[PDB]
């Protein structure tokens, strides 16, 4: 079932205090949690506290929840614990910069959803699971892994002393689970294209209405896409190192397909590394840029994410022109 953290782990987290220098840097969109590994769990506690309040969650349960969540992420190159905290931080920055647009319930729901959005990911895409008729694909027809992630999230909430949302009234509890369910399902990039087109149409015609729940859900879904893809909004060196991880996981999937007599797409073929630059260019133009463009239109304060994404697009074009540099990989 769900692995549970040790007492030394959650008890230790309770004693964590974010270093003063970081309190400032953590508020900016470009912040990279990368050089602070031992602090990731504590950084998440900190964001929840600043955004939701010191007493929003019983500290003990929060720390147990966080450490058990960390324990249930796998040792894969990309969809791991590091990614979870990175996505949660982007959400934190978005919420901080648009604080009163979102209810207390949605903020706590969204930060938790981001921390658990890829829970128990095994390193295999929906394409893989569905093409090899894996049990998960049978259980979950569409958004296969995303539905699994949500199921895992609730499972962890049900562990003894892990339910941070239990003090919520019966209706708010149901509400927060729905916010979390929709948010995590929104990370299925397949759904992003339609969501973005709908929001773009709503925004341009003037139909967009944040008081309209159906509209709210779409905005939140886009925010989720924005946070999931946030590596393209970090300083170039950071963006490049993360791209290496993204491909390490995709190539591993490609190697498995080969072993089973199925050739993988170029992107998952480690024998086609030369096409990465062009592949990323395609991704920014078809996905990232449109995403941050629409998000900025709806939530002006998120403007920095679009500016950063555009700067990285420019770096990939520079790579393609034959003006690359500094090649360091751990
Ligand atoms: N540089 C990139 N960063 C993030 N996602 C990427 C990138 N390039 C391609 N993608 C795709 O975008 C998807 C985002 O969600 P996933 O992690 O499920 O899978 C990712 C890949 O299929
Ligand atoms: Mg995912
Ligand atoms: Zn993710």
């Amino acid at each position: 079932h769900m692995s549970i953290c040790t007492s030394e782990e959650w008890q230790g987290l309770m004693q964590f205090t974010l270093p003063v220098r970081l309190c400032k840097e953590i508020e900016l969109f470009h912040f990279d949690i990368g050089p602070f590994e031992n602090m990731w769990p504590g950084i998440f506690v900190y964001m929840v506290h600043r955004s939701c309040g010191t007493s929003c969650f019983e500290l003990e349960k929060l720390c147990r929840f966080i450490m058990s969540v960390k324990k249930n992420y796998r040792r894969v190159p990309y969809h791991n614990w590091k990614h979870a905290v990175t996505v949660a931080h982007c959400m934190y920055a978005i919420l901080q910069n648009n604080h009163t647009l979102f209810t207390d319930l949605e903020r706590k729901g969204l930060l938790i959803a981001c921390l658990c959005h890829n829970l128990d990911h095994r390193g295999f895409s929906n394409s893989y699971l569905q093409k090899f008729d894996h049990p998960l694909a049978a259980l979950y027809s569409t958004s296969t892994m995303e539905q699994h992630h949500f199921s895992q999230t609730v499972s962890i909430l049900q562990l003894e002393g892990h339910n941070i949302f239990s003090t919520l009234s019966s209706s708010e509890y149901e509400q927060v689970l729905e916010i979390i369910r929709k948010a995590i399902i929104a990370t299925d990039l397949a759904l992003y294209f339609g969501n973005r087109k709908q929001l773009e149409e709503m925004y341009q015609t003037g139909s967009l209405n944040l008081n309209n729940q159906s509209h709210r859900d779409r905005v939140i879904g886009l925010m989720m896409t924005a946070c999931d893809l946030c590596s393209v909004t970090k300083l170039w060196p950071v963006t490049k190192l993360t791209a290496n991880d993204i491909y390490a996981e995709f190539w591993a999937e490609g190697d498995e397909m080969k072993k089973l007599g199925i050739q993988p797409i170029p992107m998952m073929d480690r024998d086609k590394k030369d096409e990465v630059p062009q592949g990323q260019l395609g991704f920014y133009n078809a996905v990232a840029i449109p995403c941050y463009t629409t998000l900025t239109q709806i939530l002006p304060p998120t403007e920095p994410l679009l500016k950063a994404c555009r700067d990285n697009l420019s770096q990939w074009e520079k790579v393609i022109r034959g003006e690359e540099t500094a090649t360091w990989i751990s």
Side-chain angles (χ1 to χ4, degrees):
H1 205 66
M2 294 303 90
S3 299
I4 303 178
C5 66
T6 63
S7 49
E8 300 66 56
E9 286 167 347
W10 67 267
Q11 297 181 323
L13 181 58
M14 291 189 80
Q15 298 305 307
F16 183 85
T17 293
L18 190 67
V20 173
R21 44 185 290 262
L22 296 190
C23 293
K24 190 169 175 181
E25 293 285 58
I26 198 160
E27 300 298 316
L28 306 179
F29 286 105
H30 69 276
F31 184 64
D32 174 27
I33 65 172
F36 312 105
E37 177 159 28
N38 76 294
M39 303 185 209
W40 297 346
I43 281 169
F44 182 75
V45 166
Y46 178 84
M47 297 188 290
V48 172
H49 281 180
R50 287 282 287 185
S51 182
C52 308
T54 331
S55 307
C56 174
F57 296 120
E58 184 178 71
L59 192 53
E60 300 70 51
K61 302 183 181 187
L62 177 57
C63 293
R64 292 190 190 100
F65 181 79
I66 298 176
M67 298 310 286
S68 282
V69 167
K70 170 185 186 298
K71 200 171 180 183
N72 280 280
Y73 263 93
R74 306 308 163 197
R75 304 177 74 199
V76 290
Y78 181 63
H79 299 101
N80 51 46
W81 169 243
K82 177 182 180 183
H83 174 63
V85 178
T86 288
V87 174
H89 164 269
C90 188
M91 180 54 76
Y92 172 65
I94 287 181
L95 295 177
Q96 284 291 90
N97 280 286
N98 297 274
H99 195 77
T100 54
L101 270 190
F102 308 91
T103 68
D104 297 332
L105 200 55
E106 302 172 315
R107 290 201 303 288
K108 66 183 68 174
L110 295 178
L111 288 169
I112 293 301
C114 285
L115 194 77
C116 312
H117 84 289
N118 275 135
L119 197 56
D120 189 51
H121 195 288
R122 303 296 175 58
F124 295 96
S125 67
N126 290 340
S127 299
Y128 186 89
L129 299 171
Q130 287 176 34
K131 190 54 192 176
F132 291 84
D133 304 340
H134 183 287
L136 285 181
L139 181 60
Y140 310 123
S141 316
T142 58
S143 301
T144 297
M145 285 304 297
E146 295 70 28
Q147 302 199 223
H148 180 63
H149 299 317
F150 178 62
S151 190
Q152 291 282 294
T153 299
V154 297
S155 286
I156 291 192
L157 280 174
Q158 302 171 313
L159 299 176
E160 168 174 57
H162 287 61
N163 207 319
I164 57 181
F165 296 128
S166 291
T167 55
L168 295 177
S169 60
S170 64
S171 68
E172 283 197 350
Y173 186 83
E174 300 186 305
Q175 289 180 52
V176 81
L177 281 191
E178 269 303 88
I179 287 168
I180 295 174
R181 184 187 66 69
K182 295 182 182 175
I184 292 177
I185 290 301
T187 65
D188 177 356
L189 201 61
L191 300 170
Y192 155 77
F193 304 96
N195 191 217
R196 194 266 178 174
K197 184 182 179 188
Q198 283 298 307
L199 281 171
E200 186 61 37
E201 184 194 299
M202 294 182 184
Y203 174 72
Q204 299 192 307
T205 66
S207 299
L208 185 55
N209 177 193
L210 298 182
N211 305 303
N212 182 146
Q213 192 64 54
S214 69
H215 286 30
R216 282 190 89 69
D217 293 344
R218 289 192 178 284
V219 173
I220 290 172
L222 185 70
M223 291 165 60
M224 287 299 296
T225 302
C227 298
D228 204 2
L229 311 179
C230 82
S231 88
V232 303
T233 69
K234 304 305 179 181
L235 294 193
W236 171 243
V238 177
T239 294
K240 189 63 173 292
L241 295 182
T242 297
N244 295 330
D245 300 332
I246 296 174
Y247 279 95
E249 194 174 311
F250 278 129
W251 294 333
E253 184 171 313
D255 299 336
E256 294 305 305
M257 287 173 79
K258 289 181 179 177
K259 297 180 181 176
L260 296 173
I262 304 299
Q263 174 170 68
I265 57 181
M267 192 186 79
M268 296 185 240
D269 198 329
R270 70 175 68 248
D271 286 331
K272 299 189 174 179
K273 300 184 184 186
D274 294 344
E275 294 173 34
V276 172
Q278 186 57 51
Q280 286 293 287
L281 179 61
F283 183 75
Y284 280 60
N285 293 316
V287 178
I289 291 293
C291 174
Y292 294 114
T293 296
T294 296
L295 180 70
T296 296
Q297 292 171 178
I298 297 170
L299 309 176
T302 65
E303 161 88 309
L305 297 176
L306 171 59
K307 188 189 177 304
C309 177
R310 282 174 176 161
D311 289 335
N312 283 316
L313 170 58
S314 185
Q315 292 298 318
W316 280 119
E317 300 180 323
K318 178 180 303 183
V319 171
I320 295 171
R321 292 199 301 282
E323 301 175 54
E324 180 173 61
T325 316
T327 309
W328 288 297
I329 317 175
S330 48

PDB file of all heavy atoms in Angstrom, residues 144-165:
ATOM      1  N   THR A 144      -4.674   8.385 -17.338  1.00  0.00           N
ATOM      2  CA  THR A 144      -4.288   7.205 -16.579  1.00  0.00           C
ATOM      3  C   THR A 144      -3.435   7.445 -15.345  1.00  0.00           C
ATOM      4  O   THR A 144      -3.833   7.082 -14.242  1.00  0.00           O
ATOM      5  CB  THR A 144      -3.543   6.196 -17.471  1.00  0.00           C
ATOM      6  OG1 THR A 144      -4.420   5.736 -18.505  1.00  0.00           O
ATOM      7  CG2 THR A 144      -3.065   5.011 -16.648  1.00  0.00           C
ATOM      8  N   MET A 145      -2.257   8.034 -15.523  1.00  0.00           N
ATOM      9  CA  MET A 145      -1.383   8.273 -14.383  1.00  0.00           C
ATOM     10  C   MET A 145      -1.932   9.330 -13.430  1.00  0.00           C
ATOM     11  O   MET A 145      -1.774   9.219 -12.216  1.00  0.00           O
ATOM     12  CB  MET A 145       0.020   8.672 -14.851  1.00  0.00           C
ATOM     13  CG  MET A 145       0.849   7.507 -15.389  1.00  0.00           C
ATOM     14  SD  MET A 145       1.001   6.167 -14.187  1.00  0.00           S
ATOM     15  CE  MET A 145       1.894   6.975 -12.854  1.00  0.00           C
ATOM     16  N   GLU A 146      -2.572  10.351 -13.985  1.00  0.00           N
ATOM     17  CA  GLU A 146      -3.139  11.415 -13.168  1.00  0.00           C
ATOM     18  C   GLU A 146      -4.214  10.874 -12.221  1.00  0.00           C
ATOM     19  O   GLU A 146      -4.271  11.265 -11.060  1.00  0.00           O
ATOM     20  CB  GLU A 146      -3.710  12.516 -14.067  1.00  0.00           C
ATOM     21  CG  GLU A 146      -2.662  13.264 -14.924  1.00  0.00           C
ATOM     22  CD  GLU A 146      -2.060  12.420 -16.050  1.00  0.00           C
ATOM     23  OE1 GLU A 146      -2.740  11.498 -16.536  1.00  0.00           O
ATOM     24  OE2 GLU A 146      -0.913  12.692 -16.468  1.00  0.00           O
ATOM     25  N   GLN A 147      -5.063   9.970 -12.704  1.00  0.00           N
ATOM     26  CA  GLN A 147      -6.098   9.411 -11.840  1.00  0.00           C
ATOM     27  C   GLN A 147      -5.419   8.588 -10.755  1.00  0.00           C
ATOM     28  O   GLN A 147      -5.863   8.560  -9.612  1.00  0.00           O
ATOM     29  CB  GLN A 147      -7.080   8.546 -12.643  1.00  0.00           C
ATOM     30  CG  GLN A 147      -7.780   9.285 -13.782  1.00  0.00           C
ATOM     31  CD  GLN A 147      -9.045   8.585 -14.259  1.00  0.00           C
ATOM     32  OE1 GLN A 147      -9.300   8.482 -15.463  1.00  0.00           O
ATOM     33  NE2 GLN A 147      -9.854   8.114 -13.313  1.00  0.00           N
ATOM     34  N   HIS A 148      -4.318   7.933 -11.105  1.00  0.00           N
ATOM     35  CA  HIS A 148      -3.593   7.136 -10.125  1.00  0.00           C
ATOM     36  C   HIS A 148      -3.007   8.051  -9.049  1.00  0.00           C
ATOM     37  O   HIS A 148      -3.091   7.756  -7.858  1.00  0.00           O
ATOM     38  CB  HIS A 148      -2.464   6.347 -10.795  1.00  0.00           C
ATOM     39  CG  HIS A 148      -1.679   5.501  -9.840  1.00  0.00           C
ATOM     40  ND1 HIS A 148      -2.240   4.454  -9.138  1.00  0.00           N
ATOM     41  CD2 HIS A 148      -0.384   5.566  -9.446  1.00  0.00           C
ATOM     42  CE1 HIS A 148      -1.325   3.912  -8.355  1.00  0.00           C
ATOM     43  NE2 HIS A 148      -0.191   4.568  -8.520  1.00  0.00           N
ATOM     44  N   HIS A 149      -2.416   9.164  -9.477  1.00  0.00           N
ATOM     45  CA  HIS A 149      -1.822  10.120  -8.551  1.00  0.00           C
ATOM     46  C   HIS A 149      -2.835  10.611  -7.507  1.00  0.00           C
ATOM     47  O   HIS A 149      -2.513  10.720  -6.318  1.00  0.00           O
ATOM     48  CB  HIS A 149      -1.244  11.321  -9.317  1.00  0.00           C
ATOM     49  CG  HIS A 149      -0.157  10.959 -10.287  1.00  0.00           C
ATOM     50  ND1 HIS A 149       0.853  10.068  -9.981  1.00  0.00           N
ATOM     51  CD2 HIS A 149       0.094  11.390 -11.548  1.00  0.00           C
ATOM     52  CE1 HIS A 149       1.678   9.970 -11.009  1.00  0.00           C
ATOM     53  NE2 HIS A 149       1.240  10.761 -11.972  1.00  0.00           N
ATOM     54  N   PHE A 150      -4.054  10.906  -7.949  1.00  0.00           N
ATOM     55  CA  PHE A 150      -5.089  11.374  -7.035  1.00  0.00           C
ATOM     56  C   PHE A 150      -5.483  10.286  -6.047  1.00  0.00           C
ATOM     57  O   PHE A 150      -5.659  10.544  -4.853  1.00  0.00           O
ATOM     58  CB  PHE A 150      -6.331  11.819  -7.803  1.00  0.00           C
ATOM     59  CG  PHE A 150      -7.451  12.261  -6.913  1.00  0.00           C
ATOM     60  CD1 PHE A 150      -7.290  13.353  -6.066  1.00  0.00           C
ATOM     61  CD2 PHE A 150      -8.662  11.574  -6.899  1.00  0.00           C
ATOM     62  CE1 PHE A 150      -8.319  13.759  -5.212  1.00  0.00           C
ATOM     63  CE2 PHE A 150      -9.700  11.969  -6.050  1.00  0.00           C
ATOM     64  CZ  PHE A 150      -9.524  13.065  -5.205  1.00  0.00           C
ATOM     65  N   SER A 151      -5.625   9.064  -6.550  1.00  0.00           N
ATOM     66  CA  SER A 151      -5.995   7.938  -5.709  1.00  0.00           C
ATOM     67  C   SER A 151      -4.938   7.737  -4.622  1.00  0.00           C
ATOM     68  O   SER A 151      -5.258   7.425  -3.476  1.00  0.00           O
ATOM     69  CB  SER A 151      -6.125   6.675  -6.562  1.00  0.00           C
ATOM     70  OG  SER A 151      -6.704   5.627  -5.803  1.00  0.00           O
ATOM     71  N   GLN A 152      -3.676   7.924  -4.993  1.00  0.00           N
ATOM     72  CA  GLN A 152      -2.561   7.784  -4.065  1.00  0.00           C
ATOM     73  C   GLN A 152      -2.604   8.893  -3.019  1.00  0.00           C
ATOM     74  O   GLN A 152      -2.317   8.671  -1.845  1.00  0.00           O
ATOM     75  CB  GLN A 152      -1.244   7.858  -4.835  1.00  0.00           C
ATOM     76  CG  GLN A 152      -0.995   6.657  -5.724  1.00  0.00           C
ATOM     77  CD  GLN A 152      -0.512   5.476  -4.928  1.00  0.00           C
ATOM     78  OE1 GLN A 152       0.585   5.509  -4.367  1.00  0.00           O
ATOM     79  NE2 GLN A 152      -1.326   4.429  -4.857  1.00  0.00           N
ATOM     80  N   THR A 153      -2.953  10.094  -3.460  1.00  0.00           N
ATOM     81  CA  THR A 153      -3.038  11.243  -2.567  1.00  0.00           C
ATOM     82  C   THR A 153      -4.061  10.992  -1.452  1.00  0.00           C
ATOM     83  O   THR A 153      -3.778  11.208  -0.276  1.00  0.00           O
ATOM     84  CB  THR A 153      -3.437  12.512  -3.353  1.00  0.00           C
ATOM     85  OG1 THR A 153      -2.446  12.787  -4.353  1.00  0.00           O
ATOM     86  CG2 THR A 153      -3.562  13.710  -2.418  1.00  0.00           C
ATOM     87  N   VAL A 154      -5.247  10.524  -1.825  1.00  0.00           N
ATOM     88  CA  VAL A 154      -6.281  10.257  -0.835  1.00  0.00           C
ATOM     89  C   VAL A 154      -5.854   9.108   0.070  1.00  0.00           C
ATOM     90  O   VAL A 154      -6.139   9.123   1.269  1.00  0.00           O
ATOM     91  CB  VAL A 154      -7.636   9.930  -1.502  1.00  0.00           C
ATOM     92  CG1 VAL A 154      -8.120  11.133  -2.296  1.00  0.00           C
ATOM     93  CG2 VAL A 154      -7.504   8.715  -2.403  1.00  0.00           C
ATOM     94  N   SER A 155      -5.162   8.121  -0.498  1.00  0.00           N
ATOM     95  CA  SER A 155      -4.689   6.993   0.295  1.00  0.00           C
ATOM     96  C   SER A 155      -3.766   7.499   1.395  1.00  0.00           C
ATOM     97  O   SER A 155      -3.856   7.054   2.534  1.00  0.00           O
ATOM     98  CB  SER A 155      -3.933   5.977  -0.574  1.00  0.00           C
ATOM     99  OG  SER A 155      -4.821   5.237  -1.390  1.00  0.00           O
ATOM    100  N   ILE A 156      -2.873   8.426   1.056  1.00  0.00           N
ATOM    101  CA  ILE A 156      -1.958   8.963   2.058  1.00  0.00           C
ATOM    102  C   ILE A 156      -2.715   9.767   3.107  1.00  0.00           C
ATOM    103  O   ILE A 156      -2.353   9.753   4.282  1.00  0.00           O
ATOM    104  CB  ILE A 156      -0.861   9.857   1.428  1.00  0.00           C
ATOM    105  CG1 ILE A 156       0.090   8.989   0.595  1.00  0.00           C
ATOM    106  CG2 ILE A 156      -0.092  10.594   2.517  1.00  0.00           C
ATOM    107  CD1 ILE A 156       1.358   9.694   0.154  1.00  0.00           C
ATOM    108  N   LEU A 157      -3.759  10.470   2.679  1.00  0.00           N
ATOM    109  CA  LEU A 157      -4.569  11.268   3.602  1.00  0.00           C
ATOM    110  C   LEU A 157      -5.250  10.370   4.626  1.00  0.00           C
ATOM    111  O   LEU A 157      -5.509  10.787   5.755  1.00  0.00           O
ATOM    112  CB  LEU A 157      -5.646  12.043   2.845  1.00  0.00           C
ATOM    113  CG  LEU A 157      -5.289  13.336   2.118  1.00  0.00           C
ATOM    114  CD1 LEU A 157      -6.507  13.808   1.334  1.00  0.00           C
ATOM    115  CD2 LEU A 157      -4.851  14.399   3.121  1.00  0.00           C
ATOM    116  N   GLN A 158      -5.526   9.132   4.227  1.00  0.00           N
ATOM    117  CA  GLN A 158      -6.198   8.172   5.094  1.00  0.00           C
ATOM    118  C   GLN A 158      -5.273   7.407   6.045  1.00  0.00           C
ATOM    119  O   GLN A 158      -5.746   6.627   6.869  1.00  0.00           O
ATOM    120  CB  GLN A 158      -7.013   7.189   4.241  1.00  0.00           C
ATOM    121  CG  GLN A 158      -8.053   7.873   3.352  1.00  0.00           C
ATOM    122  CD  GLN A 158      -8.704   6.920   2.363  1.00  0.00           C
ATOM    123  OE1 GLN A 158      -8.022   6.141   1.697  1.00  0.00           O
ATOM    124  NE2 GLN A 158     -10.027   6.988   2.252  1.00  0.00           N
ATOM    125  N   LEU A 159      -3.964   7.621   5.939  1.00  0.00           N
ATOM    126  CA  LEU A 159      -3.027   6.947   6.839  1.00  0.00           C
ATOM    127  C   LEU A 159      -3.223   7.557   8.223  1.00  0.00           C
ATOM    128  O   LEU A 159      -3.614   8.722   8.340  1.00  0.00           O
ATOM    129  CB  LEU A 159      -1.579   7.157   6.378  1.00  0.00           C
ATOM    130  CG  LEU A 159      -1.188   6.623   4.996  1.00  0.00           C
ATOM    131  CD1 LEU A 159       0.255   7.012   4.688  1.00  0.00           C
ATOM    132  CD2 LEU A 159      -1.355   5.109   4.951  1.00  0.00           C
ATOM    133  N   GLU A 160      -2.960   6.782   9.274  1.00  0.00           N
ATOM    134  CA  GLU A 160      -3.136   7.290  10.634  1.00  0.00           C
ATOM    135  C   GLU A 160      -2.316   8.545  10.910  1.00  0.00           C
ATOM    136  O   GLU A 160      -1.103   8.564  10.709  1.00  0.00           O
ATOM    137  CB  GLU A 160      -2.773   6.224  11.677  1.00  0.00           C
ATOM    138  CG  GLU A 160      -2.667   6.811  13.085  1.00  0.00           C
ATOM    139  CD  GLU A 160      -2.461   5.772  14.171  1.00  0.00           C
ATOM    140  OE1 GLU A 160      -1.474   5.005  14.102  1.00  0.00           O
ATOM    141  OE2 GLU A 160      -3.293   5.736  15.105  1.00  0.00           O
ATOM    142  N   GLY A 161      -2.990   9.590  11.381  1.00  0.00           N
ATOM    143  CA  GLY A 161      -2.313  10.837  11.690  1.00  0.00           C
ATOM    144  C   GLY A 161      -1.839  11.641  10.491  1.00  0.00           C
ATOM    145  O   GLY A 161      -1.035  12.563  10.646  1.00  0.00           O
ATOM    146  N   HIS A 162      -2.338  11.312   9.302  1.00  0.00           N
ATOM    147  CA  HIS A 162      -1.943  12.024   8.084  1.00  0.00           C
ATOM    148  C   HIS A 162      -3.019  12.926   7.490  1.00  0.00           C
ATOM    149  O   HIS A 162      -2.725  13.710   6.594  1.00  0.00           O
ATOM    150  CB  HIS A 162      -1.510  11.035   6.994  1.00  0.00           C
ATOM    151  CG  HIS A 162      -0.179  10.393   7.239  1.00  0.00           C
ATOM    152  ND1 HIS A 162       0.080   9.604   8.337  1.00  0.00           N
ATOM    153  CD2 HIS A 162       0.956  10.388   6.498  1.00  0.00           C
ATOM    154  CE1 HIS A 162       1.315   9.137   8.261  1.00  0.00           C
ATOM    155  NE2 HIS A 162       1.866   9.599   7.154  1.00  0.00           N
ATOM    156  N   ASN A 163      -4.258  12.837   7.970  1.00  0.00           N
ATOM    157  CA  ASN A 163      -5.308  13.663   7.380  1.00  0.00           C
ATOM    158  C   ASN A 163      -5.338  15.111   7.837  1.00  0.00           C
ATOM    159  O   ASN A 163      -6.016  15.471   8.805  1.00  0.00           O
ATOM    160  CB  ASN A 163      -6.691  13.052   7.592  1.00  0.00           C
ATOM    161  CG  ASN A 163      -7.667  13.476   6.507  1.00  0.00           C
ATOM    162  OD1 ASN A 163      -7.676  14.637   6.089  1.00  0.00           O
ATOM    163  ND2 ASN A 163      -8.491  12.542   6.044  1.00  0.00           N
ATOM    164  N   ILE A 164      -4.612  15.947   7.108  1.00  0.00           N
ATOM    165  CA  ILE A 164      -4.526  17.368   7.404  1.00  0.00           C
ATOM    166  C   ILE A 164      -5.825  18.143   7.146  1.00  0.00           C
ATOM    167  O   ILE A 164      -5.994  19.258   7.651  1.00  0.00           O
ATOM    168  CB  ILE A 164      -3.395  18.015   6.576  1.00  0.00           C
ATOM    169  CG1 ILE A 164      -3.641  17.770   5.083  1.00  0.00           C
ATOM    170  CG2 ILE A 164      -2.054  17.448   7.009  1.00  0.00           C
ATOM    171  CD1 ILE A 164      -2.561  18.349   4.163  1.00  0.00           C
ATOM    172  N   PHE A 165      -6.738  17.558   6.371  1.00  0.00           N
ATOM    173  CA  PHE A 165      -8.005  18.214   6.031  1.00  0.00           C
ATOM    174  C   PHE A 165      -9.206  17.793   6.884  1.00  0.00           C
ATOM    175  O   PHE A 165     -10.321  18.254   6.643  1.00  0.00           O
ATOM    176  CB  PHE A 165      -8.370  17.942   4.563  1.00  0.00           C
ATOM    177  CG  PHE A 165      -7.407  18.526   3.563  1.00  0.00           C
ATOM    178  CD1 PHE A 165      -6.863  17.725   2.561  1.00  0.00           C
ATOM    179  CD2 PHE A 165      -7.075  19.879   3.589  1.00  0.00           C
ATOM    180  CE1 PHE A 165      -6.007  18.262   1.598  1.00  0.00           C
ATOM    181  CE2 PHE A 165      -6.217  20.427   2.627  1.00  0.00           C
ATOM    182  CZ  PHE A 165      -5.683  19.618   1.632  1.00  0.00           C
TER     183      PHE A 165
END
